[PDB]
Design a protein around this ligand. Sequence first.
Ligand SMILES: CC[C@H](NC(=O)[C@H](CS)NC(=O)CCC[C@H](N)C(=O)O)C(=O)O
Ligand SMILES: [Fe+2]
Length: 329
Amino acid sequence: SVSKANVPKIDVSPLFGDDQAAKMRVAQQIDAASRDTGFFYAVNHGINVQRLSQKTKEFHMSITPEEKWDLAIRAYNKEHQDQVRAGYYLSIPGKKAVESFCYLNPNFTPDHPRIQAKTPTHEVNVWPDETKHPGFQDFAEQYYWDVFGLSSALLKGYALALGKEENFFARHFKPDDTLASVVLIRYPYLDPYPEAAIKTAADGTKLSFEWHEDVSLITVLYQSNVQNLQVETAAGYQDIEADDTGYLINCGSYMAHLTNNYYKAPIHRVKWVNAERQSLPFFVNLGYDSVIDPFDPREPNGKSDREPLSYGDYLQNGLVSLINKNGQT
Ligand SMILES: CC[C@H](NC(=O)[C@H](CS)NC(=O)CCC[C@H](N)C(=O)O)C(=O)O
Ligand SMILES: [Fe+2]
């Protein structure tokens, strides 16, 4: 029966410092995890995750149906044709339990040239009224930069792990142009829980979200203390234990591509659990024109035949493909 994933807890604090050998020892840990199940917990990360959980719950539990329509992405509100990514993703009582709110780089304003050019995947964030949601926008924008900083350090880890200089990834991850996103996902408790909102896997497991690989370089994830995630291994799906003080880290398919699958993008899925919980990912995306030249650290000459891929085009394609495969979230 269903076994358990080895998901080590890695103290990432050296990645913020200047002790280079200590960084290498962290990089080894990241290497090992990335070659095993593909997941680890980043601990001693310096983010106030209790406030993140509190502020998010306050938002989710106070936003009204009226405000949800007002903020809705175009999948739910045809009036908002510019909102492909950022905004509110509504639940559908009786059919779809999950709901969420996604936002992008706060630097994407009307003044930004990618907004002026109408480049796909770039949007100006939408927000509820401040007086109705006091402090929320401020909180959420500062969270973006806090987790941006953690993620930059984790990217130093990954670079060192792969034999590169520590800025190999992080040089492409910049406040001015990153396509990274935060998604504040609510999974509700429902009694009765509608069967329409539950999918059944081939192996019989009841799921809220089917198997997939992440569309990201890496994913940096906070979750409530409710176990739900499973990672695919050759021996089948394995449960990932919850830890509501750590960040769960995994690679996305852009990392798999550029490393010739040396760091795979682990296939994972979300079990159905009837419990109120939070899932708050930060998808570490680069800039629209960023290109990382692939390499294969298994080969003496490090050479890959993999095509260098422009990140923005990879992202557009991946986000669309994920909706087609696993449904509009
Ligand atoms: C909705 C369920 C939930 N799945 C997800 O969030 C899935 C798999 S990681 N990812 C996406 O849908 C990509 C969202 C991208 C975001 N709108 C963006 O524009 O950057 C889960 O894993 O809990
Ligand atoms: Fe995922």
